[PDB]
RNA sequence: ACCCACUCGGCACCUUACGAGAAAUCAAAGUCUUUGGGUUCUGGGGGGAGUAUGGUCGCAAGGCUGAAACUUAAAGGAAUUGACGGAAGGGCACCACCAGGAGUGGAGCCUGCGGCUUAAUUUGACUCAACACGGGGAAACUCACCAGGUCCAGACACAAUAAGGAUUGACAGAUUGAGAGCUCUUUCUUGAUUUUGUGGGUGGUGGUGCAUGGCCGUUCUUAGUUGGUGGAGUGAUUUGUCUGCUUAAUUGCGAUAACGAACGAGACCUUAACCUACUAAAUAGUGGUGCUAGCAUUUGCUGGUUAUCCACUUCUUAGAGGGACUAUCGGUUUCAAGCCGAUGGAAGUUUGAGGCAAUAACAGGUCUGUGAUGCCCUUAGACGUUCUGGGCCGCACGCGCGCUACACUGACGGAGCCAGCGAGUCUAACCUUGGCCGAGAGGUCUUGGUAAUCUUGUGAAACUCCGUCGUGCUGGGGAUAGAGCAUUGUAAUUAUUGCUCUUCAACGAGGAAUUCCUAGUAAGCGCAAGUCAUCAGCUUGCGUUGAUUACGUCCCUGCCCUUUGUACACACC
């Protein structure tokens, strides 16, 4: 046929990063628990799901993307 | 010809083997005498009914009833 | 000298074959396993090789005598059937020719093929039997090619990672052709569905039609293939299956060691022709009647009226029948099969035209129709797939099929005005009448039809008639090109198609060559169907107008057949 070429640079993938995560939540001196990061007022996401903290940006990942709550 | 439609069944079948494939081709010609619902013979066939020896003569005479 | 009869001994031929032989053949090649008349010579698988060596003869060239090593499974004879020939004799045919028709080959464009060009211009096929072929009319798709971007739709098994998350997704920005979370930033989400690895799969218009199936084309516009009982032969085989005649035909007659048959041809089937006979019909039509228009008026003539009723089946439809069997008569022939002419006939060229179609062959074409398929390749930086964009259309030029022309048997313009084969919309937008608007293309409002019901009598084109032009590249011809308007489509640029104005090329009948054709045929002419969103200069069918010329032959070509040769049989590649 022909075989091969490449001006180079192959494309990669993704990782789902790492993170021992949900440390986010904080409980005081025995044993009251206060949530850090605020949750979602979409009926689909019964307020377990949180909003990621960027800039302007607070965002529901559970809603696969859906919705832009901003405080 | 037409008798083909009437009297022969055919089938082709592809038989897939380890090496390649073979073609089986079967042809059956059925007794037309037995036809049942169609023509009982080939268009070819021409039977003559076989007469009968006659013992003629017997000078006139007539029967009455 | 000549004729007849006989007889010795010659050179030969003929027919037989009791007899011989592996056969071809042989009055010897007979009198041979029922093996002996006399005698002489030579051979003992093929090659090595009539070679080496010694002897001998010769002027020589050479003659006579004449080994082995080694190699090898056949070499060889006769006949049989095939195949094949640049041998001979016959035949068949408008993919041959004769007599001619209409052309192509010259021109413009259309369209395939080569070639060149190209990022790519995807590819198969190259005499008939490749090149308007792959139903191949490609804007996306198709699509295979090129520039680039996603995705897994990587079954299953085992192992590994791993609930402290195996894995999944994404808003905005960056990026990107892109409102692709492709990747990146950032940090939520998801929960054992995946991920990683090996094994194994899977897809592929990737390769192989020289691995196959199937299908198809070609031989073949051909006429050939086989078996029973008999005859010949040790046998493979042959005769039957043939000199002739005849047919489109191994179709028949006839001849005959053959007789009588079967596949194939024929029969059969389909379609086109004929039925005042049959059965019928508001989804076909005719006559009467009513309702009614117009013109004459003296009855009349020409229409309207899917039902106002009555009757019919000539025309239309399709079931069932009938019909033709080359009939009658006559010429001709071996007085056979047949052929010819005349009359009759809807029909007498296999009635016309097709469908089916034996045995065998080809390294014909097709793996790019198939979830038909072997093997090879490839398989996540994909040859899987999808998305964006380009390409198959690229243009010094060679070849093929075509369309339109060169005008006056014509172009233009009024007017006349007649087909047949088709096809059309359900969970959809197909065939479209009618009304308006518009120069046109088209638009718009309604409408009938899943259809013998509506489009549609598809009022098709050539054609007919009355005019204009008047032989002038002319008002023949309409290539090329400019501007504008609409239609299909998400998309029209490289211009899908349609319309209007304008531009007005070559082409003044086409060298060598070469295609096709015998009656409703050729040629002219349009239409419907296929393809189809849009696009026919293509095909497949259809009807309309409708001739000239053969009704013969073997000169060219092609092919079949005998006879003949063969050292071929994988068969003259
Ligand atoms: Mg968190
Ligand atoms: Mg037949
Ligand atoms: Mg003999
Ligand atoms: Mg003898
Ligand atoms: Mg004698
Ligand atoms: Mg020897
Ligand atoms: Mg030697
Ligand atoms: Mg010597
Ligand atoms: Mg010597
Ligand atoms: Mg001398
Ligand atoms: Mg010697
Ligand atoms: Mg010697
Ligand atoms: Mg021979
Ligand atoms: Mg001629
Ligand atoms: Mg000519
Ligand atoms: Mg290709
Ligand atoms: Mg041919
Ligand atoms: Mg594409
Ligand atoms: Mg995707
Ligand atoms: Mg794997
Ligand atoms: Mg593997
Ligand atoms: Mg495939
Ligand atoms: Mg082949
Ligand atoms: Mg094949
Ligand atoms: Mg090939
Ligand atoms: Mg002919
Ligand atoms: Mg013969
Ligand atoms: Mg035979
Ligand atoms: Mg024939
Ligand atoms: Mg009157
Ligand atoms: Mg009157
Ligand atoms: Mg009738
Ligand atoms: Mg007559
Ligand atoms: Mg017929
Ligand atoms: Mg080949
Ligand atoms: Mg195939
Ligand atoms: Mg394959
Ligand atoms: Mg296909
Ligand atoms: Mg199949
Ligand atoms: Mg591939
Ligand atoms: Mg092309
Ligand atoms: Mg060519
Ligand atoms: Mg052609
Ligand atoms: Mg006219
Ligand atoms: Mg206007
Ligand atoms: Mg309707
Ligand atoms: Mg009609
Ligand atoms: Mg001129
Ligand atoms: Mg003109
Ligand atoms: Mg364009
Ligand atoms: Mg182009
Ligand atoms: Mg002019
Ligand atoms: Mg001419
Ligand atoms: Mg097109
Ligand atoms: Mg069409
Ligand atoms: Mg075509
Ligand atoms: Mg010889
Ligand atoms: Zn949410």
Query: What span, in angstroms and rounded, lies between the C-alpha atoms of B41 and B58?
Result: 42
Q: What is the DSSP letter of B33?
A: G
Per-residue CA distances from B64 to A29, B23, B61 (Å): 145, 77, 10
Q: What spacing in Å lies between the alpha carbon of B62 and ligand 20's midpoint?
A: 109
Longest alpha-carbon distance in chain A: 72
Q: Specify the nucleotide whose C1' lies closest to residue A22 (CA).
A: C164
The DSSP line for A24-69 is -SEE-SSS-EE--S-B--STTS-SSSBEEE-SS-EEESSSSS--EE
Rounded, the Å distance between the CA of B8 and C1' of C347 is: 35
Which experimental method was this entry solved with?
X-ray
> What is the stated resolution of the deposited model, in angstroms?
3.0
């037409």: which residue's tokens?
B2
Please report, for residues A4, A47, A56, A58, the alpha-carbon distance to residue A51 in angstroms, rounded to integers and kept in the order given: 46, 10, 12, 5
């Amino acid at each position: 046929x022909x075989x091969x070429x490449x001006x180079x640079x192959x494309x990669x993938x993704x990782x789902x990063x790492x993170x021992x995560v949900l440390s986010y939540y904080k409980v005081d001196a025995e044993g009251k628990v206060t949530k850090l990061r605020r949750e979602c007022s979409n009926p689909t996401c019964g307020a377990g799901v949180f909003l990621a903290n960027h800039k302007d940006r607070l965002y529901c990942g559970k809603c696969h993307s859906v919705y832009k709550v901003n405080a | 010809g037409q008798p083909v439609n009437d009297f022969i069944d055919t089938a082709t079948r592809h038989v897939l083997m380890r090496q390649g494939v073979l073609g089986i081709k079967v042809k059956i010609m059925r007794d037309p005498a037995k036809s049942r619902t169609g023509p009982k013979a080939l268009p070819d066939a021409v039977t003559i009914i076989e007469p009968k020896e006659e013992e003629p003569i017997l000078a006139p005479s007539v029967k009455d009833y």
